[PDB]
Amino acid sequence: ETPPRFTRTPVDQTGVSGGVASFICQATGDPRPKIVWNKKGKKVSNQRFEVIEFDDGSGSVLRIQPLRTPRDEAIYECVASNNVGEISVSTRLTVLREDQIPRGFPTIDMGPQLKVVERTRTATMLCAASGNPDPEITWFKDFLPVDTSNNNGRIKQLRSESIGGTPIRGALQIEQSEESDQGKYECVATNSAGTRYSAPANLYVRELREVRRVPPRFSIPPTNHEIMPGGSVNITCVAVGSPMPYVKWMLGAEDLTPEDDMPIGRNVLELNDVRQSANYTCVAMSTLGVIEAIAQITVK
Amino acid sequence: DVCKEKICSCNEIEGDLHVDCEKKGFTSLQRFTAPTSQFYHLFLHGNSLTRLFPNEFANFYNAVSLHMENNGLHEIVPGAFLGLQLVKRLHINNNKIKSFRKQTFLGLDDLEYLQADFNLLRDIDPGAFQDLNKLEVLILNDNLISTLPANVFQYVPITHLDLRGNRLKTLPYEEVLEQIPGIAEILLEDNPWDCTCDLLSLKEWLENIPKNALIGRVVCEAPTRLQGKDLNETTEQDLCP
Ligand SMILES: *[C@@H]1O[C@H](CO)[C@@H](O)[C@H](O)[C@H]1NC(C)=O
Ligand SMILES: *[C@@H]1O[C@H](CO)[C@@H](O)[C@H](O)[C@H]1NC(C)=O
Ligand SMILES: *[C@@H]1O[C@H](CO)[C@@H](O)[C@H](O)[C@H]1NC(C)=O
């Protein structure tokens, strides 16, 4: 009924010896287009390349690894074909050896690491690149490009803007982790000079660690003290539970400890120049409840 | 005899063939077979596989990952996993396995992923993982591991070590902590850490460790002099006066 049409075509790429090259080519049509990768006429055939098809079937990716020069060069052709028609696009690969790398070629200062994330949580794969002109970051999961398109989704590629003479970031953020999301990720820095890949990073997805929830309990209660007037006493208040409750010090209804740095688990109160008797109230707080205990300070 | 015997649901997607035998009530798998050409992920969740004897899964040599959790498993006779060279991922959490002995994980050469959380685990033979040389991620949270033996992770490429929720007083650098340089995620939270002269090694190690590799906090449960305090901000004098 309909002829084939290119929805995405491979572009010219400049890679490094022992590196990776990936060409993306996908088309639409009825019946569905068949994607063939030809190297100067005939189809590529070796033990270093690999054709990875889209789950859609819309297209595929040519994966050359590791890059060998001048063997890998140069031009390849994507051919989409059905019963009703056929179309073709070409593109040039260039692979420069280790002493042909320009100043300002994309470099990965920090790649992605192995990551085991509990399901339905956030998993943000990191990357940091540097090159001239400034490299653009992009991602591949299991030899396929990561759809980080503008349309709202869990998979966002972070701007992660760090300022100055610092490297570019471009971290891949994955909200609501799933069993589909786990797999082999790869970061890719790309500029005018060419393309650099990061070492592969496995993402694993596990079940959530069931944690028994417990309301706060005073492991170390605030003790009472008698002191020579103008003396200095340090009262230790320690509370436990899950989640570990904040520990705060109060004098009457007056808050002493600042909310911004409210310690989790443990708080010691430092009383200096005490020439007045008073009761100090330690207070532990968590989403499972609030408790309090008194420390009676008397003056000798 | 599965799957043409209709016993389990071996639906063929996505990209991998999942053999779902979860909650079918299997007591042994020496009587059963599995496809010759296809590779598969085997799921033996709630089946009540109480004991694993030598050369179970023998006809399941083509399994890529084994997932047998909530079986109430407690006894693993050495060589029970024999033949599973292909397996990369082993789920044996949520059972009652009280210890790891040597040759417990016999047969699993390719294994990269091990989950044994919630198992009341206590003793772990030094040469328990010594042949699992692809084990990148070891998850042992919520158990009763008192100590880790000297050479446990020698030549084991551990990258994710989840040790939360145990009875773990200390962690030595000598042999144990030095032998895992490649860590990227380690989880030590919820352990009765005894901050004494013997924990110094941990502290310093956590300093030299890659940043954000430690997930969670290491709080001192002992002594009461130090209880509730982060190892983060513990002066050496206080650990070792
Ligand atoms: C308690 O006050 C003493 C002075 O006697 C001080 O040296 C010590 O650091 C204080 N304790 C704290 C801040 O925890
Ligand atoms: C502290 O509490 C005791 C007993 O509850 C009471 O006798 C005393 O007056 C209190 N002191 C105060 C509130 O300053
Ligand atoms: C305490 O730990 C983390 C670092 O992982 C962070 O909250 C903070 O930078 C640390 N504070 C220090 C080292 O004083």
Residues in A closer than 8 angstroms to B219, CB to CB, are 265
Report yes or no: B164 at the A interface, CB cutoff 8 Å: yes
What was the experiment behind these coordinates? X-ray
**Which two structure tokens, joined as six digits, stand for B2?**
């599965």
**Mutation for A interface: B113, B139, B217, B227, most A CBs within 10 A:** B227
Q: Which atom of ligand 1 is nearest to the CA of A268?
A: 14
- The set of residues, in sequence order, having a beta carbon less than 8 Å from that of B108 and lying 6+ positions away, is B81, B84, B85, B87, B90, B132
**Residue in chain A lying closest to B89 (CA):** A204
Of B137, B141, B228, the CB nearest to A266: B228
Report yes or no: B185 at the A interface, CB cutoff 8 Å: yes
Contact yes or no for A115/A202 (Cβ under 8 A): yes
**Residue A116 three-state SS:** strand
Report yes or no: A266 at the B interface, CB cutoff 8 Å: yes
Indicate if ligand 2 lies below 6 Å from the C-beta of A296: yes
**Residue in chain B lying closest to A267 (CA):** B228
CB contact (8 A) between residue B228 and residue A220: yes
Indicate if ligand 1 lies below 6 Å from the C-beta of A268: yes
CATH code of residue B104: 3.80.10.10
CA distances (Å), origin B156, targets B133, B170, B179: 5, 21, 8
CB contact (8 A) between residue A116 and residue B185: yes
Q: Which residues of A83-122 are buried (b: 16+ CB within 10 A; e: fewer)?
A: eeeebebebebbbbeeeebeeebbebeebbbbbbbeeeee
Ligand 2 centroid to residue A298 C-alpha, Å: 10
Ligand 2 centroid to residue A227 C-alpha, Å: 17
CA-CA-CA-CA dihedral for B1, B3, B9, B10, to nearest 10: 130
Ligand 1 centroid to residue B233 C-alpha, Å: 15
**Which two structure tokens, joined as six digits, stand for A222?**
């605030």
CB contact (8 A) between residue B224 and residue A55: no
CB contact (8 A) between residue A265 and residue B219: yes
DSSP string, chain B: -TTTT-SSB----SSSEEEE-TTS--S-SSS----SS--EEEE-TTS---EE-TTTTGGGTTEEEEE--SS---EE-TTTTTT--S--EEE--SS---EE-TTTTTT-SS--EEE--SS---EE-GGGSTT-TT--EEE--SS------TTTTTT----EEE--SS------IIIIITT-TT-SEEE--S--EE-STTTHHHHHHHHHSPTT-B-S--BEEE-TTTTT-BGGG--HHHH--
Contact yes or no for A95/A13 (Cβ under 8 A): no
**Which two structure tokens, joined as six digits, stand for B204?**
């310093």
Site to substitute for ligand 2 among A274, A276, A279, most atoms within 8 A of C-beta: A279
**Mutation for A interface: B16, B158, B159, B191, most A CBs within 10 A:** B159
What are the structural domains, with CATH classification, of chain A?
Answer: 1-101 (2.60.40.10), 102-209 (2.60.40.10), 210-300 (2.60.40.10)
What's the domain range around B209?
1-241
CA-nearest residue for atom 10, ligand 2, is: A279
Q: What are phi and psi of B100, to 5 degrees?
A: -100, 120
Paired strand residues for A88: A79
| Cα–Cα distance for residue pair B132/B167, rounded to 1 Å | 25
Contact yes or no for A63/A21 (Cβ under 8 A): yes
Structure letter (DSSP) for residue A200:
P
Indicate if ligand 2 lies below 6 Å from the C-beta of A279: yes
- Domain tally for chain B? 1
| Cα–Cα distance for residue pair B135/B150, rounded to 1 Å | 18
Q: Which atom of ligand 1 is nearest to the CA of A234?
A: 1
Structure letter (DSSP) for residue A199:
P
CB contact (8 A) between residue A238 and residue B162: no
**Which two structure tokens, joined as six digits, stand for B190?**
């919820």
